[PDB]
Task: inverse folding
């Protein structure tokens, strides 16, 4: 039986290939990316605070050309902090159910908690509606402060709208899927946390770009 | 008399699938024609062979 | 024959089809979106670095007595950084050439075939895998030697770049010691490997913008 | 008597399992039967078939 | 009847768990979310027990 | 007997190690943390020993 | 007859010992160069493919 000998030998070989497949720390790339996002986020937050302080002294000495610019800077800083802290709270509520070790990225692959709070059945739960509303209101109020795709920050506003979208997106096959269902449904916890921390890095980048065009 | 054509198919398919597993595990490259044939492509060829052997194992004494 | 024989060959059938077990479409979409965001942030970072180099030009032109050393160090850092960046981009483009006509179709990448046949052979590094590791270590060494290892100037930036650009053996969650390249890229989907390479490129850009941040001060 | 059809079903189902695994690895979208077949459909068909024979054979 | 029934049921659950794990299927019907991990566990633990018992 | 017993235990531990590796089950008994790697190691050692011993029969 | 059975047994032991070494990432060096799991896998799988090819005729 040249076939049974093969099976009796090679089922162990295929179990070994599967064990090597499972032993790849592919999902730890999300965790390493998240660590880098956090670090770059404190770095960019410190840069933003330094720019805010700089503008503070600039209009304290010269409240003639850009005092209202500093007022707008404070308002965007507060709105950005509110959105950042909302995302931070969502990130904490999902980082509290991975285990005692917050650096064991290989087990943060369940996705069950986050899709049980953002949406029930086929539509949004009224706290997952809150996430989408927060994204949309951040985008809208920021665009109002800067000016929508015209006047000033016109290119930046267009960059902002491409970041914090909520428009329904069509997948490869062609069905039209809602934004929050596309972006966070079925994603492992560490992938969702990495995406949220990236969404915070866009908040920091957006505000540092805003203060960049204020000197 | 047809038990010797199944033995040939069984043995040759076993060799092909084992060699495909070998080249997939060790990232080897055999160069005999066309492309470099990789080890992933050889795993795919071993899977084609294993599917054929599974099919022809349904109809045997 | 034997029930145990039929059950081991059922396990054979089950585990040979587990060769088709990969990351889900959501993990691959997350990796592809991370790659898009990483590439956009890398282009922004490169633009910021070019602006910093131009600012160093403007400073050194007026006062070629205190900034000339800083300018020469910065320009050589840019040479090393762009050499390593272009090497990583060459590997990254070679990986992206093997995925298909649609580049943003992340669901189908998930292969890990072209890349681990150009990095690894058996249990060693194929010459270009050793070339990659040598490039990483040479970027680490030649960047440190332009600043000073753990002492003198920049203090802790050397310690940071000695943490991002390691090739030392890493211990995984089980406790077994893994070689850096095999840990980071062996068996990884194409889109995951490309995202990780873009992460390394982001480390390059962050490192060199943090160097030029210290240049101006 | 019926042991011939059990092995025939097992063989054909396992062949479909291997073909579906291969098509899912290689992302092949063979279009003959109705919609786009794909490798996931072949996996589903073959695995469900194998489960059906294994459940029936338990009695 | 004592070994064949459990044998076949565990084999079928192993197959279904493998299918769910490979295709990432989420079929749930209230109270519990089946998934592929649970079915794979329920089948492979059963098969390990059957292996160990038939060893003796 | 022993050549039909170690078969069963080795197969059982191989299956259990495969399961623990798939599910990332890291049960901690007295001393060290077991994990699926140890179970695969023990099962594979058992299979290697009987494949070697059964060669000379 | 006996040569093929002995070769199958020994090659299977070697290949799954190499699978064990690759699983645990061992580099056991008792003689010569670094053995590794890749070398044992190659040796065992080659001597198994050869045996199965010849046994087909």
Result:
């Amino acid at each position: 039986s040249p076939r049974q000998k093969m099976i009796n030998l090679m089922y162990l070989v295929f179990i070994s290939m599967l064990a090597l497949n499972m032993g790849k720390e592919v999902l730890s790339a999300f965790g390493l990316m998240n660590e880098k996002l956090e670090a770059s986020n404190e770095k960019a937050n410190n840069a933003n605070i330094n720019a805010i302080q700089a503008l503070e002294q600039n209009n304290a000495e010269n409240p003639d050309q850009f005092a209202e610019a500093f007022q707008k800077s404070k308002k965007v800083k507060e709105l950005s902090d509110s959105f950042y802290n909302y995302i931070e709270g969502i990130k904490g509520e999902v980082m509290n159910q991975v285990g005692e070790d917050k650096k064991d990225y290989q087990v943060m692959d369940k996705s069950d908690y986050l899709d049980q709070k953002f949406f029930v059945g086929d539509n949004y739960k009224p706290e997952g509606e809150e996430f989408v509303r927060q994204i949309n209101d951040y985008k809208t109020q920021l665009v109002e402060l800067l000016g929508g795709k015209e006047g000033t920050y016109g290119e930046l506003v267009g960059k902002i709208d491409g970041n914090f979208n909520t428009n329904d997106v069509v997948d490869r096959e062609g069905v039209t899927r809602k934004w929050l269902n596309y972006n966070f449904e079925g994603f492992p916890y560490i992938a969702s946390v990495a995406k949220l921390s990236m969404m915070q890095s866009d908040i920091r980048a957006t505000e540092q770009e805003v203060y960049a065009e204020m000197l | 008399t047809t038990k010797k054509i199944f033995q040939m198919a069984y043995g040759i398919g076993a060799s092909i699938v084992i060699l495909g597993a070998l080249f997939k595990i060790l990232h080897w490259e055999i160069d005999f024609g066309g492309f470099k044939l990789g080890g992933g492509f050889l795993l795919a060829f071993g899977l084609i062979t294993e599917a054929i052997i599974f099919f022809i194992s349904a109809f045997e004494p």
Notes: Chain F has two helices and no strands. Chain F has one domain: 2-53.
